Amino acid sequence: KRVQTFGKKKTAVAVATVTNGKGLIKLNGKNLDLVEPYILKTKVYEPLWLIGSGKLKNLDIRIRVKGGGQTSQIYAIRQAIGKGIISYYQKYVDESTKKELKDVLLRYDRSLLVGDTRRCEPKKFGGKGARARYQKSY
Amino acid sequence: RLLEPVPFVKTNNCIKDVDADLFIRSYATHLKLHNKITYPKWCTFVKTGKGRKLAPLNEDWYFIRASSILRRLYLHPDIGVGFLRRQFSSKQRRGVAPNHTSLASGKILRSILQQLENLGYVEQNPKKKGRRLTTKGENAINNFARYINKKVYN
Amino acid sequence: VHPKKYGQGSRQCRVCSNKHAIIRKYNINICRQCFRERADIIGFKKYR
Amino acid sequence: RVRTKTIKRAARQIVEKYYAKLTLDFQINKKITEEVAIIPSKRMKNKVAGFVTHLMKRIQKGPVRGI
Amino acid sequence: IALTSKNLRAIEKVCSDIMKGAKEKNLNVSGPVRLPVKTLRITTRKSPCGEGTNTWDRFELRIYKRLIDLYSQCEVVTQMTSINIDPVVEVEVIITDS
Amino acid sequence: KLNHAVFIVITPSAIAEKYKVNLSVARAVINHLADSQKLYT
Amino acid sequence: PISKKRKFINDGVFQAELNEFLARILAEDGYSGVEVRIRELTSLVQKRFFLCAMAQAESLRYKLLKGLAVRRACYGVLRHIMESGAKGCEVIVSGKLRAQRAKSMKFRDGYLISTGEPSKRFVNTATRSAQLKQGVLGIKVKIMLPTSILPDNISVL
Amino acid sequence: YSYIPKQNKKLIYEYLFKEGVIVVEKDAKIPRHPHLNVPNLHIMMTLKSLKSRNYVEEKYNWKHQYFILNNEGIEYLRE
RNA sequence: GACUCAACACGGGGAAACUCACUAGUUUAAGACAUUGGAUGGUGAUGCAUGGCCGUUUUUAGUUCGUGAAUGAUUUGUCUGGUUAAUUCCGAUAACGAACGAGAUCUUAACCUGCUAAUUAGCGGCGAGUACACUGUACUUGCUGCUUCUUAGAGGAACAUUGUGUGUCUAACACAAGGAAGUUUAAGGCAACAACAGGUCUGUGAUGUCCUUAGAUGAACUAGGCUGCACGCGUGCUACACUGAUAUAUAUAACGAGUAAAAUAUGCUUGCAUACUUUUCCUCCGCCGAAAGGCGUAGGUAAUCUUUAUCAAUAUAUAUCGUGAUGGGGAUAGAUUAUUGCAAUUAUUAAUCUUGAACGAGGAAUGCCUAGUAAGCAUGAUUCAUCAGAUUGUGCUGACUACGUCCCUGCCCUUUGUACACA
Ligand SMILES: [Mg+2]
Ligand SMILES: [Mg+2]
Ligand SMILES: [Mg+2]
Ligand SMILES: [Mg+2]
Ligand SMILES: [Mg+2]
Ligand SMILES: [Mg+2]
Ligand SMILES: [Mg+2]
Ligand SMILES: [Mg+2]
Ligand SMILES: [Mg+2]
Ligand SMILES: [Mg+2]
Ligand SMILES: [Zn+2]
């Protein structure tokens, strides 16, 4: 019927509501036709390509993204999609198919199912960044 | 230019399902064709915001701005002048001191809004907050978007 | 007498009347050294 | 990634008293440790359990040099 | 009902107590909702002087605001509130229909 | 120095190299032929 | 009307002030308290508003004021602490002290943990500056209390 | 200012008697004491004077002065 | 004041006045108490009189005891070696056994309970529509099961677990699988012993002595100065362009932080008195204003409002340039319009117009850095009446190169030598 999972890259949680439908796939109120830059577009479409466009004619998808920059957001979206489709399959479709899909995803790469755990480390005094200290002249 | 083999169908119904810049351009063109909106007096020798230190260089930038504003209105429920200004902000290089963010020249925006309301596209709502789109205007925008989509398909 | 209402010399530390280095956030109005000593009693614990 | 005397000492103490309870299974060992000794941490407890397991492994294949 | 406090565990205990009190009878009590802990951070520079590689220290007074709802009469709620309690947890009861 | 002019396998750089021209002029030429980086044949 | 953050800070400040007031007043007392002859104190507070370490420190200061042989006094204090069931202690006295230049003198008995949040928890610490002949003598007392159990121990039954 | 009216002084004394203690605020240009609208400087001066005779005992905290009345002082106040 | 690391955007020190200690002067008692004695005040003198606090030695691994053993200071323990981030362990052993330090602990950040909870968070549920699709999608007003996301309490999870190497097959390491995670998972916080004649009495009513005490080195007021400039050394910012400026359009953060003076009326001579109520901080919004800002009003003492299903810039897309000190660059300057303030000149800052300097990647030297790091990009907060080029947090775009070694530099260790011990 309807399944809600998230992605996560840096801060940037893309929540993918995957429902029964005709196969549209959207972001907040906009088609995945947009995303934003033409270069990165492939990182969002990739899981779909892996799984096949015919498999998602049963499944509508909406995605709510919040927080983060651009690339991170894209990554989050991708992650959400990956988790989402697979989650749907695990519940309402068969198990074998789900397994197959998972295998395919693994063969392509990590990041689709399992998350990127990295996050901005606290800046420390005596410097501008995390490690980068100021400057001594003696 | 934009078109490509995608793995889904696109419900080309509202403007959120259209590519932005192109749409804006189209709207500007339409406006020009109509002669529905003017180009006040000061428009032709003003600077759009503190940070720009230079005139637009687009000739019909006003129209473009208006189009953008329409889109913005459609996107959000109730949107002020301040918000608009914030939206059309850029980096102001203060020469030697590092850059700050720069709030846009709001006057022009306000004028545009006024014009739109006169024409019957935007609506100062007494409930809630500052000026959203008026329903007819919204419908028109949607129609335009649809047209654009059709053109692209063709 | 001359306007003593808005400036560094207008107000002071609550504790020792020093016009320099006052923590003026949250209306604490303690010069920072003094605050550092009384941070325990006020309920300011160093975690990170 | 080596164990302090406190961990080691604890391990030594266990296997002296509670060798009966223990078998080469980590979870079980951890449970036993929890039952017996007063480790306030989780991580520390886990570490202790691991070392106990290691000790156990070392025995059965020979003398440990302790206990 | 809003329970503002500085000490977490104590606050939690208080909340638990009030829940217990509620569970007696007559109280449609919504569960305890802990609010966003708006932490007062002061970054003071250590050292009175200007000597030593200027180490700062981030203090954090982390206030725990806690929130809980009920559909009841004033006296009863007052009674419920009386768990004895002490100077540490700051209580406030709102007796509004809205 | 190389003061290129204005009055008189397609890319702007190539054009510049060949006839000794400003790249705005190259762009213009390209446009004419057709009739932010470029590629033409 | 005042905000929550503002309120909390204010309360903290008030607490601090109260503590300071108590310190000022009660040189003759085993002071710790802070929970609200005494009538005057109450009045003062109203006007304003609209085993233990501190006590030991105070005692030490009093002794110093009286004029003892210092070391002996410290020893006595240590003994008292021991009697009162302390797992460990530490006293420091730095300042002028007999000679003109320098001279910090440690006085430990039982073991005194210094690093960790255990230190923060399981020690009471106190600092008094006893004014004397030609300057100030600088007390700091540090008591390790009975634990509610230390993180280092792993007690097998 | 250095006026010091007599009536005002008397009033201050009465107030002190009623209380037993006076929290002065060691501030130069603060106009009034919280309860009684007297120039604060005058009040401070009076308290200092009292302290000098040992009619009042003082224990200075931060900002405030915290004066507590002595038995001799009380006796004097009888007037 | 501070002078190698361990002074030099440091004293939270971005000083127009106040700050203010200084300069030119002018007032005042804030001279208690019995003109005299006698205190009281000092951003006066002295950190080499001290307190406390902070720095460094040192975030490294180090310090100590009990007893034993080896005229004395002492040594041993606390070590040839292996191992460790670590006097971390193992192993050897005149030592054995402790304690502090390390480790543990604390705080975050990392992934789960599809258990605990549901506003001031959402998701749906569903009415009401407005547009368009097919036989649902986008968008607002009105009403009120789920907890994935949003908040935050308690739990869980990694221990080198299983696999295989190297290792006295000891302590342990390397690789592989599993996994959210395998350098104590990442980051801090805490900080032993002993010091340094390190800093601070210019943080203190912590504080000694000496000085000063009405022609005050006290406080208060009026300017002026800390910003003055042949020059030397710091920390930064901005640059030297085309992976770029310019100008439109598009995209999208996280931590945050936000409440004596003025208005209007009455009574009298711009002043006072009396009455009465919004404003003192964040600004929505609506109007005026090129711009800055202004005026009117609105919410907010805050998960409610500023505002956060988006407050930013790098981004990206499309145009104008076209390698030319060039539209790179914005110094220096000239003249207004504002805002803050009692007061803006030695221009507070801001805006508008114009001025178009050095700089074509930087010599001798030297700094910082190993994964969400460097760098770039901004931005919140601290100071704040006003003013970031500072600091301090926070995020966004996300490299290179190790994965080691003692060659330099600096610490530490054993041996060795010393006429040094102020080392
Ligand atoms: Mg320890
Ligand atoms: Mg300034
Ligand atoms: Mg001055
Ligand atoms: Mg010194
Ligand atoms: Mg030794
Ligand atoms: Mg530690
Ligand atoms: Mg200066
Ligand atoms: Mg600064
Ligand atoms: Mg070096
Ligand atoms: Mg010698
Ligand atoms: Zn102070």
Residue ranges covered by each domain of chain E: 1-98
Q: How far apart are CA C41 and CA G22, in angstroms?
A: 14
Classify each residue of F15-41 as buried b or exposed e, where b means 16 or more C-beta atoms within 10 Å of its C-beta.
bbeeeebeeebbeebbeeeeeeeeeee
Cα–Cα distance between A31 and B145 in angstroms, integer?
14
Q: How far apart are the first and last CA of chain B?
A: 12
Q: Which two tokens stand for residue B43?
A: 């428009």
Instruction: Give the residue from chain G lying closest to H70, CA to CA.
Output: G40
| Euclidean distance between CA atoms F22 and F28, whole angstroms | 10
Instruction: Determine the Cα–Cα distance for residues H34 and G44; give it in Å rounded to an integer.
Output: 13
Helix (H) or strand (E) holding F17: helix F12-19
Rounded (10°) angle between helices B106-119 and B61-75: 70
Residues with their C more than 2.5 Å from the N of the next written residue in chain E, i.e. before a break, are: none
Burial environment of residue G22 by CB neighbours within 10 A (0 to 12, 13 to 18, 19 or more): middle
Q: Which two tokens stand for residue A41?
A: 């577009």
Under a CB-based contact definition with an 8 Å cutoff, are residues H32 and H44 in contact? no
Any chain B CB within 8 A of the CB of A40?
no
Bridge partners (DSSP) of residue G142 are: G90, G125
For A79, the 3-state DSSP assignment is: helix
Residues 72-111 of G with CB under 7 A from strand I: 90, 92, 94-96, 100-102, 104, 106, 111
Q: What does chain C come to in residues?
A: 48
Residue holding tokens 């400087």? H41
Q: Name every residue whose Cβ is closer than 8 Å to that of residue H17 and which is 6 or more positions away in sequence.
A: H69, H74, H77
Look at residue G132 and give its three-state secondary structure.
strand
Distance (Å, whole) CA A36 – CA B23: 15
Residue at token pair 């909106």: B37
Q: Hey, what amino acid is at G101?
A: R
Q: Do chains G and E touch (3 or more CB pairs under 8 A)?
A: yes
Owning domain of residue C33: 1-48
Contact yes or no for B92/B51 (Cβ under 8 A):
yes
DSSP output for chain H: -----HHHHHHHHHHHHHHSEE-----SS----SSS---HHHHHHHHHHHHHHTSEEE---SS---EEE-HHHHHHHH-
In this structure, the number of other CB atoms found within 10 A of the CB of residue A137 comes to: 3
- Compute the radius of gyration of chain D from its Cα atoms: 11
- Among E42, A13, G148, CA closest to D38: G148
Asked if A7 contacts A61 with a C-beta cutoff of 8 angstroms, the reply is no
Pairing of strands G105-108, E64-67: unpaired
Check which CATH number belongs to the domain holding H74 and give it. 1.10.10.10
Minimum-distance residue to I160 (CA–C1') = D1
Do strands A26-27 and A59-66 pair parallel, antiparallel, or not at all (unpaired)?
parallel
- Strand positions, DSSP E, F1-41: none
Number of domains in chain C: 1
Strand I contact residues in chain D (15-54), C-beta within 7 Å: 24, 26, 40-44, 46-47, 49-51, 53-54
Using C1' positions and the CA of G127, the closest nucleotide is I52
- Angle among Cα B75, B80, B81 to the nearest 5 degrees reads 115
**Residue H44 to residues B29, C1, H3, Cα–Cα distance (Å):** 81, 20, 14
Tokens for B6, please give them: 């995608």
User: What three-state secondary structure class fits G19?
Assistant: helix
Q: How far apart are CA A64 and CA A87, in angstroms?
A: 17
The H or E element containing residue C23 is strand C22-23
| Cα–Cα distance, C33 to C21 (Å, whole number) | 8
Backbone conformation region of residue H69, classed left if phi is above 0, alpha if psi is from -120 to 50, else beta: beta
In the PDB record, what is the listed experimental method?
A: cryo-EM
State which residues form the domain around A54.
1-138
Residue pair D7/D55 in contact (Cβ under 8 Å)? The answer is no
- Contact residues of H toward G, CB < 8 A: 19-23, 34, 59-62, 64, 66, 68
- A107: helix, coil or strand? helix
Residue pointed to by tokens 């934009």: B2
Neighbouring chains to G with at least 3 Cβ pairs closer than 8 Å: C, D, E, H
Nearest CB neighbour to C44, from listed E42, E46, E48: E42
Helix (H), strand (E) at residue G106: strand G105-108
G39 touches chain E (CB under 8 A): no
Other CB atoms within 10 A of residue A44 CB = 21
CATH architecture of D1-60: Orthogonal Bundle (1.10)
Q: Report the distance separating Cα A18 and Cα A9, nearest Å.
A: 20
Whether the CB-CB separation of B37 and B63 falls below 8 Å is answered with yes
| Interior/surface letters D28-54, b for 16+ CB within 10 angstroms, e for the rest | ebbebbeebbebeeeeebebbbbbbbe
Resolution, in Å, please? Answer: 3.2
Quick one: which of G155, G6, G146, G153 has its CA closest to G85? G146
Radius of gyration of the CA atoms of chain C, in A: 13
Assign residue A129 a region (left: φ > 0; alpha: ψ between -120 and 50; beta: otherwise): beta
Q: Give the separation between CA A34 and CA B71, rounded to whole angstroms.
A: 15
* CB-CB contact of A100 with A109 (8 Å): no
Q: Residue G15 has which token pair?
A: 């607490």
Q: Are G112 and G142 in contact (CB under 8 A)?
A: yes
**E1-98 to CATH, choices 1.10.579.10, 3.30.70.600, 3.40.1170.60, 3.40.47.10:** 3.30.70.600
- Looking up tokens 């209390």 gives G145
| Separation of CA B74 from chain center | 10
Rounded Cα–Cα distance for residues B81 and B83 (Å): 5
Phi, psi of G146 (to 5 degrees): -60, 130
Tokens of B98: 């590092």
Coil, strand or helix at B23: helix
Do residues G104 and G126 make contact, with C-beta atoms less than 8 angstroms apart?
no
Q: Record the tokens describing residue E96, joined without a space.
A: 């509004």
Tokens of A108: 């392509």
Phi-psi domain of C17 (left: phi exceeds 0; alpha: psi -120 through 50; beta: other) = left
The Cα F12–Cα E29 span in angstroms is 74
For residues E42 and E59, the answer to whether their CB atoms sit within 8 Å is: yes
Residues H79/H39, Cβ–Cβ less than 8 Å: no
Compute the distance between CA of residue A5 and CA of residue A17 in angstroms, rounded to an integer. 7
Q: How many domains does chain H have?
A: 1
CB A74 within 8 A of CB A82: no
- What's the sign of the alpha-carbon dihedral A40, A43, A46, A47? negative
User: What does the alpha-carbon distance between residue G89 and residue G78 come to, in Å, rounded to a whole number?
Assistant: 7
- Using the Cβ of E38 and the Cβ atoms of chain G, whether some distance falls under 8 Å is answered with yes
Query: How far apart are alpha carbons H61 and G111 in whole angstroms?
Result: 37
Q: Quick check: E56 and E44 in contact, CB under 8 A? A: yes
Dihedral of alpha carbons H11, H12, H14, H15, sign: positive
F7 lies in which domain range? 1-41
- Geometric angle at alpha carbon F36, from F32 and F38, rounded to 5°: 55
Give the phi and the psi of residue G20 in degrees, each rounded to 5: -60, -45
Give bridge partners of residue C45 from the DSSP assignment.
E60
Helix (H) or strand (E) run with residue E78 in it: helix E74-81
Q: Show the 3-state SS of G45-81.
A: HHHHHCCCHHHHHHHHHHHHHHCCCCHHHHHHHHHHH
Q: Does E44 sit within 8 Å of C43, measured CB to CB?
A: no
CA distance B147 to B15: 11
DSSP at E25:
T
Rounded distance between C-alpha atoms, residue D52 and residue D10, angstroms: 9
H21-22: strand order across its sheet: H21-22, H67-69, H56-58
Q: Report which DSSP code applies to E11.
A: H
Binding residues of C for Zn(2+), as ranges, are 13, 16, 31, 34
List residues bridging with G92 in a β-sheet. Answer: G106, G140
Q: How far is CA F33 from CA B73, D37, G55, in A?
A: 41, 87, 96
d(CA G155, CA D33): 11
- According to DSSP, the residues that pair with E40 across neighbouring strands are E61
C14, H29: Cβ pair inside 8 Å? no
Q: Which two tokens stand for residue G24?
A: 């000022």
Residues 1-40 of C with CB under 7 A from strand I: 1-10, 13, 15-16, 18-26, 31-37
